A paper describes a structure:
The nucleotide binding and leucine-rich repeat (NLR) class of intracellular immune receptors is an important component of innate immunity in plants and animals. The central domain, termed NB-ARC (nucleotide binding adaptor shared by APAF-1, plant R proteins, and CED-4) in plant NLRs, is a hallmark of this protein family and plays a key role as a molecular switch, mediating conformational changes required for activation. NB-ARC domains consist of a nucleotide binding domain (NB), a helical domain (HD1), and a winged helix domain (WHD). In these cases, one NLR acts as a pathogen sensor, requiring a second helper NLR to initiate immune signaling. Such is the case in the solanaceous NRC immune receptor network, which is composed of multiple sensor NLRs that require an array of downstream helper NLRs termed NRCs (NLRs required for cell death) to successfully initiate immune signaling.
To further define the interface between SS15 and NRC proteins, we attempted to crystallize SS15 in complex with the NB-ARC domain of several NRC proteins. We obtained crystals of SS15 in complex with the NB-ARC domain of SlNRC1, a tomato NRC that is inhibited by the nematode effector. Because purification and crystallization trials of SS15 in complex with NRC2NB-ARC and NRC3NB-ARC were unsuccessful, we moved forward with the SlNRC1NB-ARC-SS15 crystals. We propose that SS15 prevents conformational changes that are critical for NLR activation by binding and immobilizing the NB-HD1 hinge. By binding and immobilizing a critical hinge loop in the HD1 region of the NB-ARC, SS15 restricts movement of the NB domain relative to the HD1 and WHD domains, preventing immune receptor activation. Candidate residues (highlighted in red) were shortlisted on the basis of the interface identified in the co-crystal structure of SS15 and the SlNRC1 NB-ARC domain, as well as being conserved in SlNRC1, NRC2, and NRC3 but not NRC4 and AtZAR1. Combining information from the cocrystal structure and the alignments allowed us to select 13 candidate residues to test by mutagenesis in NRC2. We conclude that the E316 and D317 residues are critical for SS15-mediated inhibition of NRC2 and that mutating these residues to their equivalent amino acid in NRC4 allows Rx/CP-activated NRC2 to evade SS15 association and inhibition. Mutational studies of this interface allowed us to generate A amino acid variant of NRC2 (NRC2D317K) that evades SS15 inhibition without compromising receptor signaling capacity.
Residue numbers in the entry:
A (entry chain B): 18 to 223
B (entry chain A): 153 to 494
The structure:
Amino acid sequence: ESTPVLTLQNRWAYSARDEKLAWDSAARDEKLELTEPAGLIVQFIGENSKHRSVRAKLPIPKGNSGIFYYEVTISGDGDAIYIGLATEQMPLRDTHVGYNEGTYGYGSSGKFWGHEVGGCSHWGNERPYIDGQPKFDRNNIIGCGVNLKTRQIIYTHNGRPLETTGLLVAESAAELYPCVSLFTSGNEIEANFGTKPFKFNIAEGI
Amino acid sequence: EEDDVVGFDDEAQTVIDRLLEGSGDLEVIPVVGMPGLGKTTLATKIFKHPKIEYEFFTRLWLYVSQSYKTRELYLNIISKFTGNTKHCRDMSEKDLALKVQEILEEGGKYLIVLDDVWSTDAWDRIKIAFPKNDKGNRVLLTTRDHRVARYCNRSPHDLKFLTDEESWILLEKRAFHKAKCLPELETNGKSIARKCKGLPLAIVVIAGALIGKSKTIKEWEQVDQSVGEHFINRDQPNSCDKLVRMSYDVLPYDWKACFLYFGTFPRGYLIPARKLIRLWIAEGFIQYRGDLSPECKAEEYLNELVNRNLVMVMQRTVDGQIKTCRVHDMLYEFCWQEATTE
Ligand SMILES: Nc1ncnc2c1ncn2[C@@H]1O[C@H](COP(=O)(O)OP(=O)(O)O)[C@@H](O)[C@H]1O
């Protein structure tokens, strides 16, 4: 459980089906720009601000061994952002990770989403959230991951691990993919899947 | 204002997709969700959508109140298409229905909006007017009963809530009428928006209260504090009365009476504004104080109750004045309950 299971060659990517339905809608103004061939930097280039999500190419490892983990550095305004793990079915518009069902997320507003634990707050579809978590803005380095053995979700803020005791990811047959949801124009992020050193020391943390 | 519609774009898209998909047979599309979740709002968004105007040229909107009768529905349809209900005023319900069926068989690919469908009984009765002329016809349905939806379609559309962020943007846009929120109120305002949990109606109501409250930090936090986290109770969301009361208590006494007067009409009733003006004058709520003539003072009160959002604008005239108005069925609960106490 303490050995990291890296998806080093993982990158932000819309799938063939995501692009199919994304170009089924004739609106271009609703897209994020990807800094290829790296595809680790994403920029919200829309005029009007709305929830827009992008997912990684590869899903999480499905083993009972080691840790899945990635980090995201925030540039731009850094506000109205949600980082976490989404299903492939998750809409990339008008929803954020964690808000969407079967997904779990950490919001810039300071909320963990999708974690039904005793004493949590219920939102819209009585969607379980846990409020009062650290907010994040520009220049912060946020980690999201899952201990594959205990199934406990892992969040880190600028390399500091956060309270996630009892926050489990469901062991479904469906694959979960790294996902980030931006809102405001000018928001920029850069993803770290292990290509650069993590600020959270996995070796000295798990 | 179409400008004020927030975050329902992919919702509209996914609904338009299901409208465009399907066979030539008549296909019925139910949108479901609790009162105030914005079903009627989304229905209007899709109805006015360019690509829906493109596919379905024959378009019509019908508000099927819980208190609606089938004879009236057929007569409403006939009046819309032909403008001559003379001969149909004494026609039997079947003769009316067959007459509509004729218009629809001659009419092309058509889209019918039925707003606030209350029962499957009503649906099955209404359906008699629609031919299965296999022209790819569609019927858009809004309802508050999940059973009603699932009877029409096994896979109905559950209308989403708003995100914290979407909640804030709607609140700001309604509370400040296109102007931006002052930074000092931002934290309290966002807290307030959050406690709405992403319910459009709750957000719009409280905007009306805040408009009426001074734009001071202390007044907004009073509000934020008084709005407990779980005020919208799943047992009675119809008991958002406390959210309404907060907006209500801010109203001058003159407007309180006018507002509660809505309790004197039937639930969900489509009220012609000019008719209401004259009646408000009759009941003596419009005090001729100063220069203001009673008609101008009545329309000001009306415009103001619309500014407070508590009354919903249903139609505008060519003048840009209010043609017909409605108070939401959840607001009627308050008007009915409070007006039996006062
Ligand atoms: N996407 C939206 N953006 C802004 N306001 C909205 C939105 N959806 C709904 N509303 C507001 O919600 C209020 C109540 O919605 P309504 O359609 O009457 O509820 P329902 O039909 O679900 O009973 C309306 O006054 C409308 O302005």
